[PDB]
Amino acid sequence: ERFKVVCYYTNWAWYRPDNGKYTPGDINPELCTHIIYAFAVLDKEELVIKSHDIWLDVENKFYEKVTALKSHGVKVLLGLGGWDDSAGDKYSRLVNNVSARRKFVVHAVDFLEQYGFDGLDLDWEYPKCWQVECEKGPDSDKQGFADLVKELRKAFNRRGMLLSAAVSASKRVIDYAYNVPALSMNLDWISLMTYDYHGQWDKKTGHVAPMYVHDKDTDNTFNVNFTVNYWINKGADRKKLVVGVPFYGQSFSVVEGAGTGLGAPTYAGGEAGDETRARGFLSFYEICERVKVKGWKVHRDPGGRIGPYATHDDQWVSFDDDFMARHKAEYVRAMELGGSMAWSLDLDDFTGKYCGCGKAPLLTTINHVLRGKEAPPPCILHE
Amino acid sequence: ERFKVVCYYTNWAWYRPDNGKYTPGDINPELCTHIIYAFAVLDKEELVIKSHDIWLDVENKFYEKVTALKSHGVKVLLGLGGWDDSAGDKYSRLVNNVSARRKFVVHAVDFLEQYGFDGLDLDWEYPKCWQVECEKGPDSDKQGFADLVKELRKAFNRRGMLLSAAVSASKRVIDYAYNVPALSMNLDWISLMTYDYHGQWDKKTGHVAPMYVHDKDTDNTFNVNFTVNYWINKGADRKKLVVGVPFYGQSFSVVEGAGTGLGAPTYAGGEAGDETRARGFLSFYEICERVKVKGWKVHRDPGGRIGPYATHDDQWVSFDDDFMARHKAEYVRAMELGGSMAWSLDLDDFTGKYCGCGKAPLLTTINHVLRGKEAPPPCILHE
Numbered sequence A, B: 001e002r003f004k005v006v007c008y009y010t011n012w013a014w015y016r017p018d019n020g021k022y023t024p025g026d027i028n029p030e031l032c033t034h035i036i037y038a039f040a041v042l043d044k045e046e047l048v049i050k051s052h053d054i055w056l057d058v059e060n061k062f063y064e065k066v067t068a069l070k071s072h073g074v075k076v077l078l079g080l081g082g083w084d085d086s087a088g089d090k091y092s093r094l095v096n097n098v099s100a101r102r103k104f105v106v107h108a109v110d111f112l113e114q115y116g117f118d119g120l121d122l123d124w125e126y127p128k129c130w131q132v133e134c135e136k137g138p139d140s141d142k143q144g145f146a147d148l149v150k151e152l153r154k155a156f157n158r159r160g161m162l163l164s165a166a167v168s169a170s171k172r173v174i175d176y177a178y179n180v181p182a183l184s185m186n187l188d189w190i191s192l193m194t195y196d197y198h199g200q201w202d203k204k205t206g207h208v209a210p211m212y213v214h215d216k217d218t219d220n221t222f223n224v225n226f227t228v229n230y231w232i233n234k235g236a237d238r239k240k241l242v243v244g245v246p247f248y249g250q251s252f253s254v255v256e257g258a259g260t261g262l263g264a265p266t267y268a269g270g271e272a273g274d275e276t277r278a279r280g281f282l283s284f285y286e287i288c289e290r291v292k293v294k295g296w297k298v299h300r301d302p303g304g305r306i307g308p309y310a311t312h313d314d315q316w317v318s319f320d321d322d323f324m325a326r327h328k329a330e331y332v333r334a335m336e337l338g339g340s341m342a343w344s345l346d347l348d349d350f351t352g353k354y355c356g357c358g359k360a361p362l363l364t365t366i367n368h369v370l371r372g373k374e375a376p377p378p379c380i381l382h383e
């Protein structure tokens, strides 16, 4: 239990064409120390946890089917929030009202125990910077969020439950949102969302999760290494920091004649994948199909500062492969951090059918480094 | 029937939470003469129609569930394109290549018959002006699109299938994009997208779909009455023209101290609604909740040139209500046009729960005028 492997399971992965469909039965519990059930949501009116999908989570028992995996020795927490649920002021209204926080904490304990959860993972995106609009929220969101965490910490300790949070990798947002010393002390781990540094919103190609500074960078804080050191320098316990790894790529459509390099101007997200059906986004296995079957070209950084990207016509997608997933896990071990986090189980090649690298190659690579699981070498996409 | 009521059904309304969820079972076929399934997409590599959501459209048979409604005496067409599929050059590569057009047409007939579709609705936004960027596309997009339409017409007539298109209401785009006489002759109807004349991109408040010239207008072509007469003057058969009506509002966040009037400076789109969850956009039923429950104030034009708008704090949304929907249908009858188009079914108060005016009040009002369906009177939002 020296290093954690925190696995995000997403309930909406069931609503996917059969080859992409991911159910509780697809979880390999040997590959996780902790599983986060993403996502529950905050009721706008009552400001308490509620299921976002009663039909799957409750009627079809997906909550209980995932928490049942604790018989395998994994801890199973409920994730609250996410990007989509963080629109608007409801989380700000919760944390800035003392009586609302108290109602939330009491209800949360009962909700979690009702379904067998070992605790709660907070994924408010973000305190003050609601959906990264920092002018939107009050400055008091930072202190209100810290107070919610402290009060959840005290109530959870009476129950032996775990409390974690997924947090921003943006220096700007971190400065606005987080009392870093208080969060480090009161959380069992801090999952750094060290991805989505770049995407089609930049209007030019960029890597979803740069590891180190690149010479083409315009901001030297948009990389995992800065993010981790910034949290440490802000007062975070290194063992509390869990470094997220994206199991998906950010895709782009490149302006005609702009080339295939980093920073090339773009006009849209990439064409949607068959399984994930979201322009701007491709699962790792959809990227494998493009490289293996559709002839997309893989571009690598000889300096090892960013992971690969793949191209075809004006399409362009950046992503982490086996080698960068391995490096980031080895970075976690070298830096003596708390572990690695996976976003998300269902976007890995969990069936093994797309990449030819065995089942769940990205997650297996992380477990190899952090937990000593014997494993095959990293697979070369291009091969 | 003398007048058509062309209903857009948007499949990814299925993913909306709570009462915003809209399924094929929510379609009332008696309120439509033609149903368009929005949307399929153009495969970038093969340049043929493909499903945009295999899981809903094919695995769960939503295509066939909607085309099965033709037993009610309605025609069901597949819509291709839409705004999001119209970025980049893929439609331009199709229409400017003779062999690609032939492959597309042959495949399209088989694709439509496979799922029981009665025909195809083309929603390329837009020939030449790709996503209204007129510098991007070649002048030859106009002629290529007309040739595609002509060739689809020939093949569809062998099968008794219908062919339609949704087209721009912008004079500039119309001049660049459409061989109006050829389209009028070869299409079973032309759906004028007579909405989105104004929105947050203007950086000031304006009505989503002005009917007539208003004194605050800076451009006297940005209204439905001009668009319709412009298509007629360009050579369109009046019978072929179908006037679109928006079932949603364009929302704005207004500069502090700028007031609530038309043309007031804005700094962002409006806050997203609970169910449609898109900044700058609110469904009619979301607008009803705001007026009925949240105390938003309704502002009307005594001159009848634009529909209402609603305000609360710095929020501002313009929309068509029952009275303007009725007027636009009565305009269709007075002008002896082809009918009205509804964009889209799922944004109406289709459950009847938000406005208290019965199920699908906007669509019922249009059917009342154009098809003589008995109906309740228009509901006054303010009551």
Ligand SMILES: *[C@@H]1O[C@H](CO)[C@@H](O[C@@H]2O[C@H](CO)[C@@H](O[C@H]3O[C@H](CO)[C@@H](O)[C@H](O[C@H]4O[C@H](CO)[C@@H](O)[C@H](O)[C@@H]4O[C@H]4O[C@H](CO)[C@@H](O)[C@H](O)[C@@H]4O[C@H]4O[C@H](CO)[C@@H](O)[C@H](O)[C@@H]4O)[C@@H]3O)[C@H](O)[C@H]2NC(C)=O)[C@H](O)[C@H]1NC(C)=O
Pocket: A212, A213, A225, A226, A229
């Ligand atoms: C992630 O983010 C971090 C925070 O932003 C980055 O942290 C920075 O990392 C560098 C380390 O590379 C560190 O820089 C200094 O570290 C100590 C200061 O305490 C210095 O000794 C270092 O000086 C060495 O390197 C200099 C090169 O710039 C050189 O000028 C200097 O003379 C000395 O050279 C030795 O080391 C080199 C590298 O091994 C050799 O090439 C060179 O020949 C010298 O080697 C000899 O001496 C060594 C002992 O000094 C010995 O080991 C060797 O065998 C041989 O005998 C250096 O300037 C920053 O301070 C640090 N910043 C913070 C805030 O921590 C981090 O880089 C980033 N990671 C990545 C991958 O980007």
Ligand SMILES: *[C@@H]1O[C@H](CO)[C@@H](O[C@@H]2O[C@H](CO)[C@@H](O[C@H]3O[C@H](CO)[C@@H](O)[C@H](O[C@H]4O[C@H](CO)[C@@H](O)[C@H](O)[C@@H]4O[C@H]4O[C@H](CO)[C@@H](O)[C@H](O)[C@@H]4O[C@H]4O[C@H](CO)[C@@H](O)[C@H](O)[C@@H]4O)[C@@H]3O)[C@H](O)[C@H]2NC(C)=O)[C@H](O)[C@H]1NC(C)=O
Pocket: B212, B213, B225, B226, B229
């Ligand atoms: C949608 O977009 C279109 C753009 O193409 C706009 O089209 C324009 O529509 C106007 C009408 O709104 C049309 O105007 C002329 O139509 C004919 C000319 O052929 C005339 O009959 C009209 O003249 C009458 O109105 C004049 C305007 O005030 C007036 O000066 C004139 O003396 C005459 O007045 C009579 O009619 C008025 C309206 O009923 C009365 O107020 C007035 O007292 C007079 O009524 C008497 O006479 C009537 C018989 O003429 C009789 O019925 C009545 O009982 C009484 O005894 C008019 O000028 C434009 O030609 C046309 N433009 C184009 C380019 O096509 C359209 O307006 C727009 N819609 C909206 C809502 O904006």
